[PDB]
Design a protein around this ligand. Sequence first.
Ligand SMILES: Cn1c(=O)[nH]c2cncc(NC(=O)[C@@H]3CCOc4ccc(Cl)cc43)c21
Ligand SMILES: Cn1c(=O)[nH]c2cncc(NC(=O)[C@@H]3CCOc4ccc(Cl)cc43)c21
Lengths: 304, 304
Amino acid sequence: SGFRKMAFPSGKVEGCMVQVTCGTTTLNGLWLDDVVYCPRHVICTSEDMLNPNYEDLLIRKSNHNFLVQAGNVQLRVIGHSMQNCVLKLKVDTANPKTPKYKFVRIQPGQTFSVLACYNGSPSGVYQCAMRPNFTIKGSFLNGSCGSVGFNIDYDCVSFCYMHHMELPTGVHAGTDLEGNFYGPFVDRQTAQAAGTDTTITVNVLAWLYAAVINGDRWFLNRFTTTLNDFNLVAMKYNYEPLTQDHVDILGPLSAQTGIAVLDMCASLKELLQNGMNGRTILGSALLEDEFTPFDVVRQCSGVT
Amino acid sequence: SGFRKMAFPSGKVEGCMVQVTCGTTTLNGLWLDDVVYCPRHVICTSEDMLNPNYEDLLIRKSNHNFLVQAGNVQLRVIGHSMQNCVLKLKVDTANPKTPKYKFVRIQPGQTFSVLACYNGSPSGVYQCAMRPNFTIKGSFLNGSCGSVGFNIDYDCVSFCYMHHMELPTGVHAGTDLEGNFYGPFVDRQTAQAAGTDTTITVNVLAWLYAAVINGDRWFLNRFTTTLNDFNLVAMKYNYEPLTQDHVDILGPLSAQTGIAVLDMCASLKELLQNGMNGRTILGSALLEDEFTPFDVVRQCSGVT
Ligand SMILES: Cn1c(=O)[nH]c2cncc(NC(=O)[C@@H]3CCOc4ccc(Cl)cc43)c21
Ligand SMILES: Cn1c(=O)[nH]c2cncc(NC(=O)[C@@H]3CCOc4ccc(Cl)cc43)c21
């Protein structure tokens, strides 16, 4: 029992982190096989960030201008290419610690672990979610660019995020491992504002199921609702609309607890309208939305 | 910017986890050098747990009754001894992945990362704190016993916790790596109730400093207080008394923000008396107390 914001064990990803320096900019890179992936803004000075022409800036860089260091040993760069907003630096040595891996582009609402790094060295691991406005709320200081987000399915690491930027509001933006930004963000030091950060309804419901599984049951009410009635309330509270696909996904948690998905929706509807009244659910005074239904099943079943 | 509940990178500890089975009980063990540490209740059946005489039960066990498996390979047990509530199983092979390590006994209020394991395999990593009542609020299912808590100082892992038990209220109890339980708990399936779970005041203040560093400043007020006046309020709200030692520890965060420790105490005093009024601090609707002042400095500075 007990339910925590849990990240995946980070060992498989720690074995992939390297330091990439180009000129006076140093950030992190991800070394998989004989390729090192890193944000293309490693080639920029602080002044270039204002209006960078990456293709033009890249012309002035050769393989020897990218310094890749794995631990305290230097890697030989034998090729470099730009793919969207990431650089792929081909090195002469395959990473001996390369885990089984995939590159996946996640959808909003999906969660992942982040291994925050500085100078190619891991500082910490935390869990976050791709927000509905395609930002993530992370913990990243200067030098953290190139840190990655991932999920693990047994022994296969699915890399979904690479950190690139912090917006003026303190939220974060980045790309998948093909270098495509999540959302409309661009790697330029220009005013970019995020859209509405709506609550991930299906994740809140999954977390209310986790609360029932762990004994926090005070919020269960005598009501039910329909998807349409619930969504009228969800719209009002800046919650994402719940679909029949989300109801299907919650099926196993509904089966485990015996609480119909629409009954849990009615409980959530009353929590939105009435508030918590100074009470907590799983140690939280707000409705947590960064646990997916899959995370709840995994944590409540002990998948390793 | 951004502030997350961050765990240490778990790789160094993942390389130490093994599966220990004695008869029909399987749990986790920690393999450091040629010794495997595990909860002594691995020798008990579910029936033995009601009133176990560990010395007597241990007489019926030989080295060959302890099955230690590292990955999918078996370790040869050449000795076994009981130290308080842990068994130390000497194996014929030193763990080749043994990191630099220490065994430390933490004080209440101190935080640590937990690598939750099942069958010697890591499932997740999360951060928690030794509560003032010597329980921890973890996430542990059956089979999680032997999972460890630790801190990392650069390349040295200080192991502080080994999981042993879940109380009827869903909170957790365990020992240091010398097998001594934190608090008054015993490894017996008997009614054991926890004392008051007071709030770790010095950690809340550190987290309010983290909030100011990250731009959440709405709660800063025009007041100050004294330790004595603050503690009158802290007592009333089941907060731990703040001492001059805690004030000294917060010194570097006070220097970084320019907010005197007693001014932050007055802000916290108003938050306790007035509540949050539906507002959040660092994404939380409650006052977070599982970040120590050291955690705040480390996360806000990027120690790797
Ligand atoms: C500089 N810095 C911090 O101090 N905390 C950060 C957390 N995450 C990221 C950064 N860095 C940035 O955002 C840089 C600084 C210049 O502006 C831009 C513009 C676009 C892009 Cl892709 C990157 C950057 C951080
Ligand atoms: C069985 N079990 C779960 O299902 N979730 C658990 C989370 N953490 C621990 C356990 N296990 C226990 O607490 C066992 C079960 C029998 O009672 C006792 C009594 C003392 C001691 Cl030291 C251990 C135990 C859990």
